């Protein structure tokens, strides 16, 4: 039993280590990130989450990047500046992966890009997986 | 209501456009490929599918590349060479994706690469999605 | 402490069927098969000894 899982749960690159690709999520009703490390890290690497709105010139092209806001849960406290962020700990081994997702949608496009671009940033890869088709 | 889809259906990069990355399918019981274009194509691009055995000197590392053999279905015929291959046609638009997978597992690692490396191959991206885990 | 370190699962018992494509009035052909599986459970419930 092997399935064509790509039909129902497609995945798209979001950060290949040198460039960031906006990923459209309008046609799907869930999504989540997946982080992988290809080499041992030397320090913590934080990531920033953005989102885009449809461009005025063309409704099929994204606009400038906006920053996702924070949404506190019933336990815990809000972020210092109230904006979502992701931090990959130094303990991550080359042979393991991490996964996390945002509680809310906001715009129809999403993206992720590191706070700083350096030799330690190229040692990571990020991918986005959709889970449901509404069309 | 969002979900952490990255926990149940992790996705991994396979062909970012300039390099091929082995993907370990050992820990999961299904998988599949997803092809996406980022710029217009000029001619059909064929892809080769491989699999790797465990390396002799270290089980942590994949071995050499081996082609995946074909498995004919009930009412059908085998390929001319007997091996598995995938072809991305010309009509694919930049806003669409294609998904397909092999019927059998073979080795524990998997890989994919274009038959020839040129200006056309760099315009395609490949990602691997995997179903529930087993450990 | 087996019964928690490893599990064994069976799906159906062996079945035998006669094949109409190879059978004649002078011959017979039988087909058979079965299904089963197994998966490790807890990794902390066992140990292994080796020479060193």
């Amino acid at each position: 039993m092997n399935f064509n899982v790509g039909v129902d749960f497609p995945s798209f690159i979001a950060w290949d280590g040198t460039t960031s690709f906006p990923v459209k999520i309008d046609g799907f009703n869930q999504f989540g990130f997946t982080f992988k490390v290809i080499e041992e890290l030397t320090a913590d690497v934080p990531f920033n989450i953005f989102y885009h709105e449809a461009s005025e010139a063309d409704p099929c092209v994204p606009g400038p990047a906006i920053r996702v806001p924070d949404v506190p849960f019933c336990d815990g406290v809000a972020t210092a500046d109230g904006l979502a962020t992701v931090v990959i700990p130094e303990a991550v081994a080359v042979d393991s992966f991490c996964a996390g997702s945002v509680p809310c949608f906001n715009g129809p496009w999403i993206s992720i890009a590191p706070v700083t671009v350096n030799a330690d940033s190229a040692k990571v890869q990020v991918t986005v997986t959709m889970k449901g088709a509404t069309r | 209501m969002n979900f952490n889809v990255g926990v149940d259906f992790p996705s991994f990069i396979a062909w970012d456009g300039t390099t091929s990355f082995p993907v370990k399918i050992d820990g999961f019981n299904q998988f599949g490929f997803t092809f996406k274009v980022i710029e217009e194509l000029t001619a059909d691009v064929p892809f080769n599918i491989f699999y790797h055995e465990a390396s002799e000197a270290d089980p942590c590392v994949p071995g050499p590349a081996i082609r995946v053999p074909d498995v004919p279905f009930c009412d059908g015929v085998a390929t001319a060479d007997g091996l598995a291959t995938v072809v991305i046609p010309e009509a694919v638009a930049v806003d669409s994706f294609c998904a397909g997978s092999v019927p059998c597992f073979n080795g524990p690692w998997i890989s994919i690469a274009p038959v020839t490396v040129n200006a056309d191959s760099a315009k395609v991206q490949v990602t691997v999605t995997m179903k529930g885990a087993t450990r | 402490a087996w019964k928690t370190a490893y599990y064994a699962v069976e799906k159906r018992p062996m079945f035998f069927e006669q094949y109409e494509g190879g059978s004649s009035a002078w011959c017979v052909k039988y087909q058979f098969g079965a299904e089963d599986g197994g998966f490790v459970g807890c990794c902390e419930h066992g140990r292994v000894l080796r020479i060193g």
């Binding site: 982080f35 924070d70 506190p72 815990g76 809000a78 972020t79 979502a84 962020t85 992701v86 990959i88 991550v92 081994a93 042979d95 393991s96 992966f97 991490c98 996964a99 996390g100 997702s101 945002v102 | 952490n4 990255g6 926990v7 370990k24 050992d26 820990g27 089980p59 942590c60 885990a133 450990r135 | 990794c43 080796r50 060193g52």
Partner: peptide, 27 residues
């Protein structure tokens, strides 16, 4: 804020951490 879920490794122990046994007690 996001809570990252991670798994130990792709392999249970890609290089299994075999360990010597406790040394013999005494004479």
């Amino acid at each position: 804020m996001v809570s990252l879920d991670c798994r130990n490794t792709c392999a249970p122990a890609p290089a299994s951490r075999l360990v010597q046994p406790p040394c013999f007690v005494c004479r």
